[PDB]
Design an enzyme around this catalytic site. Structure first.
Site, short mmCIF file in Angstrom:
data_model
loop_
_atom_site.label_atom_id
_atom_site.label_comp_id
_atom_site.label_asym_id
_atom_site.label_seq_id
_atom_site.Cartn_x
_atom_site.Cartn_y
_atom_site.Cartn_z
N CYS A 234 0.82 -1.20 0.00
CA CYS A 234 0.00 0.00 0.00
C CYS A 234 0.86 1.26 0.00
O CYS A 234 2.06 1.21 0.27
CB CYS A 234 -0.93 0.00 1.21
SG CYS A 234 -1.61 -1.62 1.60
C1 WTF Z 1 -3.58 -3.48 5.09
C2 WTF Z 1 -4.82 -3.33 4.19
S1 WTF Z 1 -4.97 -4.77 3.08
O1 WTF Z 1 -6.33 -4.88 2.58
O2 WTF Z 1 -4.22 -4.60 1.84
C3 WTF Z 1 -4.40 -6.34 3.92
C4 WTF Z 1 -3.10 -6.79 3.73
C5 WTF Z 1 -2.69 -7.95 4.35
C6 WTF Z 1 -3.57 -8.66 5.14
C7 WTF Z 1 -4.88 -8.21 5.33
C8 WTF Z 1 -5.29 -7.06 4.71
C9 WTF Z 1 -6.75 -6.50 4.90
O3 WTF Z 1 -6.89 -5.56 5.59
N1 WTF Z 1 -7.92 -7.10 4.23
C10 WTF Z 1 -7.83 -8.24 3.38
C11 WTF Z 1 -8.93 -8.38 2.29
N2 WTF Z 1 -10.35 -8.19 2.80
C12 WTF Z 1 -11.53 -8.75 2.19
N3 WTF Z 1 -12.85 -8.28 2.33
C13 WTF Z 1 -13.75 -9.13 1.60
C14 WTF Z 1 -15.20 -8.94 1.52
C15 WTF Z 1 -16.02 -9.83 0.76
C16 WTF Z 1 -15.37 -10.93 0.07
F1 WTF Z 1 -16.16 -11.83 -0.69
C17 WTF Z 1 -13.92 -11.12 0.15
C18 WTF Z 1 -13.15 -10.20 0.92
S2 WTF Z 1 -11.52 -10.10 1.22
C19 WTF Z 1 -10.42 -7.43 4.10
C20 WTF Z 1 -9.22 -6.54 4.45
C21 WTF Z 1 -9.37 -5.23 3.65
#
Ligand code: WTF
Ligand SMILES: *[C@@H]1O[C@H](CO)[C@@H](O[C@@H]2O[C@H](CO)[C@@H](O)[C@H](O)[C@H]2NC(C)=O)[C@H](O)[C@H]1NC(C)=O
Ligand code: TON
Ligand code: NAG
Ligand code: NAG
Ligand code: CL
Ligand code: CL
Ligand code: CL
Lengths: 231, 97
Positions: A1
């Site tokens: 990011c």
């Molecule tokens: C640090 C922000 S990030 O999104 O890039 C990240 C980097 C490494 C580990 C976790 C995450 C993270 O915060 N998320 C992972 C993806 N996510 C998802 N939300 C949904 C919602 C619905 C669905 F069908 C699949 C997903 S995957 C939630 C969150 C933003």
């Protein structure tokens, strides 16, 4: 990011970020901007994936902007203990709690810097008045470092990718240099949300894993904009 | 410019379990389910899956509302298992994502 907070020659604060993550072909479709309403009025705006209630990108009108970047530090059992037994809260939930409760920029910086978290993170906060821009490098218990803007001494922007700013950036994943080079070339006088979008469109700041780019300025809350990348 | 992300409203005056449903009705919920199956299956170790299910009865209470109620509201609406919806919402904390 990649998250950027910057200040123009007129004293206005601009804030932009790229959210990088795999599985773009499925998550791009799920990106939404959500205006959270309290009694019919927009309390704060956020960007998430439908099904995810936490906010990694958000705005409190005429108060502050927040975005969070990943900080990989510690082991899994630290998150497990911090969540189970020490009763720390999730990283993206504190961002949203801050957008809903904090009364001003200085108060949000304190809430984001001191509330215990289950994991580390980089919080980038932008305000409305001059100098109101900061990078909060977070530990689970508190802030590891607080890095404010310094326009009068030339530091009119802060760039945060996923690494501690006081150590050198890995040459394997060096998006910080590109963001600063683009910011240095744009200039404080030409700074704008559109210009901030152009900076966050530079390669490799905008890379294969980028899902969306959000630009925002709490002092001009109506211009909040999220753009989904190469769907 | 590239396409702007859809913009929706969420009323914090509504009960947490119903806050997000006005937004979900605009989506083919199968696509949300499909995105979860690809991200989860390609990351989560089984012992976390059992563990989170082992602890759902706790995670629901000590983690602060309305985050727990909002997740439960969208999960039932989509006919998903709360353990997985909680796992996606705690994806960053699990560290395996
Ligand atoms: C640090 C922000 S990030 O999104 O890039 C990240 C980097 C490494 C580990 C976790 C995450 C993270 O915060 N998320 C992972 C993806 N996510 C998802 N939300 C949904 C919602 C619905 C669905 F069908 C699949 C997903 S995957 C939630 C969150 C933003
Ligand atoms: C999302 O919520 C906002 C605020 O509740 C809506 O904006 C209002 O729109 C009505 C007309 O539809 C106006 O009379 C109000 O003055 C507006 N208020 C504000 C604060 O802007 C907006 O229309 C809603 N959007 C959707 C798609 O329902
Ligand atoms: C505290 C829990 C376990 C209940 C829930 C959370 C999400 C915070 C969590 C926390 C930690 C965790 O550990 C992941 C282990 O991965 C090592 C093998 O690759 C899994 C989940
Ligand atoms: C950007 O410009 C400032 C002042 O000219 C300088 O201190 C800094 O090293 C420059 N950074 C890059 C990456 O060019
Ligand atoms: C969820 O399951 C119920 C059966 O109890 C069914 O009536 C409903 O249509 C299902 N909804 C979805 C989105 O699958
Ligand atoms: Cl809230
Ligand atoms: Cl910098
Ligand atoms: Cl982590």
């Amino acid at each position: 990011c990649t998250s950027i907070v910057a200040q123009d020659s007129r004293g206005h604060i601009y804030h932009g970020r790229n959210l990088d993550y795999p599985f773009g072909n499925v998550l791009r479709k799920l990106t939404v901007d959500v205006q959270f309403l309290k009694n019919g009025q927009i309390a704060f705006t956020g960007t998430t994936f439908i099904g995810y209630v936490g906010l990694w990108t958000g705005q409190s009108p005429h108060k502050f902007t927040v975005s969070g970047d990943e900080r990989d530090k510690g082991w899994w059992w630290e998150n497990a203990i911090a969540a189970l037994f020490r009763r720390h809260i999730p990283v993206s939930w504190l961002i949203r709690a801050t957008l809903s409760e904090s009364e001003n920029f200085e108060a949000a910086v304190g809430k984001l810097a001191k509330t215990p978290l289950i994991a580390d993170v980089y919080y980038i906060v932008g305000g409305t008045s001059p100098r109101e821009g900061v990078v909060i490098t977070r530990n689970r218990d508190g802030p590891a470092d607080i890095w404010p803007l310094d326009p009068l001494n030339g530091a009119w922007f802060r760039v945060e990718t996923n690494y501690d700013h006081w150590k050198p950036a890995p040459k394997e994943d060096d998006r910080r240099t590109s963001a600063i080079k683009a910011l240095n070339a744009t200039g404080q006088a030409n700074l704008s949300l559109e210009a901030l979008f152009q900076i966050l469109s530079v390669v490799p700041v905008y890379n294969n894993f980028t899902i969306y780019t959000t630009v925002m300025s709490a002092g001009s809350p109506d211009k909040y904009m999220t753009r989904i990348r190469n769907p | 410019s590239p396409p702007a992300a859809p913009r929706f409203n969420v009323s914090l005056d509504s009960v947490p379990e119903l806050r997000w449903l006005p937004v979900l009705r605009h989506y083919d919920l199968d696509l949300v389910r499909a995105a979860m199956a690809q991200v989860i299956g390609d990351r989560v170790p089984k012992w976390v899956h059992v563990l989170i299910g082992k602890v759902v009865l706790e995670l629901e209470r000590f983690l602060p509302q309305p985050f727990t109620g909002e997740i439960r509201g969208m999960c039932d609406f989509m006919n998903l298992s709360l353990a997985d919806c909680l796992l996606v919402n705690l994806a960053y904390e699990s560290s395996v994502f």
